[PDB]
Amino acid sequence: HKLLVTPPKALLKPLSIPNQLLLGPGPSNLPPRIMAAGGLQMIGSMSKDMYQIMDEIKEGIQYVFQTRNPLTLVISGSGHCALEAALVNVLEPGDSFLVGANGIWGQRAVDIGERIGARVHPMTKDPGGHYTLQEVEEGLAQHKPVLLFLTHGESSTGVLQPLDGFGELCHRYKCLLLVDSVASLGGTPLYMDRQGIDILYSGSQKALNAPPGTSLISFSDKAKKKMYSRKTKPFSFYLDIKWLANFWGCDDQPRMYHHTIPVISLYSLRESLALIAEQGLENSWRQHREAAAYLHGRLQALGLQLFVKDPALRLPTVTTVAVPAGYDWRDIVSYVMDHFDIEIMGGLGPSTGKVLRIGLLGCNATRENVDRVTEALRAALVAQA
Amino acid sequence: HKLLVTPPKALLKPLSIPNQLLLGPGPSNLPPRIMAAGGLQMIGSMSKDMYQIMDEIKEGIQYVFQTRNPLTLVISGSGHCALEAALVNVLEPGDSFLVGANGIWGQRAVDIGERIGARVHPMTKDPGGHYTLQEVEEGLAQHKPVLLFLTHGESSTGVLQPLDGFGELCHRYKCLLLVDSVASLGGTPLYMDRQGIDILYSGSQKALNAPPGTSLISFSDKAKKKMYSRKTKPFSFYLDIKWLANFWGCDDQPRMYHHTIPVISLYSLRESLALIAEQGLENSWRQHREAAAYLHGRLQALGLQLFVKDPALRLPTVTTVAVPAGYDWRDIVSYVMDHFDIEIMGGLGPSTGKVLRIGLLGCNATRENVDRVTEALRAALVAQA
Ligand SMILES: *Cc1c(COP(=O)(O)O)cnc(C)c1O
Numbered sequence A, B: 001h002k003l004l005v006t007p008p009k010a011l012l013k014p015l016s017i018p019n020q021l022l023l024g025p026g027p028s029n030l031p032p033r034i035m036a037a038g039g040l041q042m043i044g045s046m047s048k049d050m051y052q053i054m055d056e057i058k059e060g061i062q063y064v065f066q067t068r069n070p071l072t073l074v075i076s077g078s079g080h081c082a083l084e085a086a087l088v089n090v091l092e093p094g095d096s097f098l099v100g101a102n103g104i105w106g107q108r109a110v111d112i113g114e115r116i117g118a119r120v121h122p123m124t125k126d127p128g129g130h131y132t133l134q135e136v137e138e139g140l141a142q143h144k145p146v147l148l149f150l151t152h153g154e155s156s157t158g159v160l161q162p163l164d165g166f167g168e169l170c171h172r173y174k175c176l177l178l179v180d181s182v183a184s185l186g187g188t189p190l191y192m193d194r195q196g197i198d199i200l201y202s203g204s205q206k207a208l209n210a211p212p213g214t215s216l217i218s219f220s221d222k223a224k225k226k227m228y229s230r231k232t233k234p235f236s237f238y239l240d241i242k243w244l245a246n247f248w249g250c251d252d253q254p255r256m257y258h259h260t261i262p263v264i265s266l267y268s269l270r271e272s273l274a275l276i277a278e279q280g281l282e283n284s285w286r287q288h289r290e291a292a293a294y295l296h297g298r299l300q301a302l303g304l305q306l307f308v309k310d311p312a313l314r315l316p317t318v319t320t321v322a323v324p325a326g327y328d329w330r331d332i333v334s335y336v337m338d339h340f341d342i343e344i345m346g347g348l349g350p351s352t353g354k355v356l357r358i359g360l361l362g363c364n365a366t367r368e369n370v371d372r373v374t375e376a377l378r379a380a381l382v383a384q385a
């Protein structure tokens, strides 16, 4: 008859959150305008006003990606979900899939690729490494892939992968180019159409300063053709691009219900795109470049060594710092939080144990935050020694 | 250096949202506590405080589902995503999958099951219908399925599916029972462990009144055994239950990074679970029961016919009304919004073109809202006559 479970006592207490200055690889703190959007009332998930907001967002993604691609929309899930959406739609079982495995993101692309039946060909590199035109051309020639995955901003290694020329190279081998720009978008130069990128995705919670939970994606016509001529439906319904394209107003059919979009998250994402449209892409790139240069100079002043030696290969948004020999990286991370309420991170995937990671993301990429994190790091290094 | 795309003027003006009373089948309006939570600052997505909030949310789901299942968590996606996560983990290609296709939710389960290689066996019924024990047992004996899908609250048809005895019946046939309670949860009686349900899922944006974008799921040990003994990996990484289980603290291993959870959406979901824990499940059921009964009487007074004839079979949270002959249902929906700022909906799937749908969800299930939607309908009806 009765009730097994009683009302949880923890839930009868008010929600409270600590104040944390998030200076790791993401998510980032939210500016007032984004927080305000997140506190708004609901509207209809298929209403004319919702559709107008979705249209503005689409124009915003096209601006930040620098693309005129009609097939451009928001994925209702985190950065992983956008990657998975690209892969389950583009790749059919048996398809040759070339992957830049130079950190955790390439490792994740390999995993998803394998799960959906692709024949995966990793080009494996030690963390800190990047791919040359010559290396990719070799992979293209040897493996004849339908798709190449490359990470633009390798947030696990602090590496900025050059993108010029890779798209045209892929196209000469009849291969599509997929680029992960979750950590790079808004913080470094990126020009989707100019660079011949076929699939580009990013996430909301990095330099955009929106809450985590949504991601951005765009597909060239070459990519669309592959996704719309499959012999088999994608393994996913939730991420089926034909349904999503339709609902996001990317085709000539009336929008049909697919899934309920995250209405409130889209308010916030809209405002994040408004903030960078107001700032200007190039102005944002300059902000991050300068903030990163300031950070690097101060880190080296403390006698720390940047994990990526070539300044031209350093990702401005996420800086990897080699962990000083004899020092405990966990205790540095703990000290920084316990005494300054600042979050930084260690490594991720192959960079685990090797590095500290410091993020400079959007409105949080400031000289003041650089001073705050370097003051924290200094105190942690001293208490240790 | 030539930017293809200039900043979108649409984003260079303020975000504009209308004030709408949402009395369709969801999403519903947000109460003040839930809006307030949505406006908070970020914390670290893998911080101890975030983990504590996740633990409290988990206790909340165990309360609303009435289960002690350790494998209970939030899916980082809408209601569709929770359904897909259940199917992609439980079903291997070749598995027999029996489906109660008596509305759009069963049809969606067929679609997903087909995509992931299951041998799908629909028990098809006209909209308005529900399954008896005998019908299900007949399907079980015939198709010997590993899994049965049943919709609890059929929100496309207004039907409340009986659940007593179905779990016990499935287990006798060595079949797992999966139940969609997106529309029913919090609105009508439901007891996961007591009713022998193996997989139960719901959504954030129906009776809970949280923003759409997250969903709730729980798995019995029997369901766990299947997911953890399959010889093939699920087609999805983003929805892989072994990774999600671990990050959500359901394992005996330390939490490993999988994907970034939607931190802000979780503040809101936590608060929505807190509101219903304070009210009490039985009180919530009573509230919905009463509002619905009051709604049914006022609809019939206008000369309107309830689509579901048997009151015992009516879903309190979503009421289907037959479109009255002579009238344009589209114009009724439009009139109600244009003049009264209220959203109602037409049909969905097999009920498309046949019904109007009126939702009474959580704190919005009130006599006041019934009066408002009924006055709006009355004006709409008179206007067309
Ligand atoms: C709304 C609903 C769903 C789907 O939820 P989404 O969040 O729109 O994906 C599934 N089942 C039922 C019964 C629903 O009412």
Ligand SMILES: *Cc1c(COP(=O)(O)O)cnc(C)c1O
Pocket: A025, A026, A078, A079, A080, A081, A105, A151, A153, A154, A155, A180, A181, A182, A183, A203, A212, A213, B258, B259, B260
């Ligand atoms: C953070 C990140 C991801 C994954 O994002 P999630 O939101 O955690 O799923 C993928 N790629 C890069 C480069 C990232 O920085």
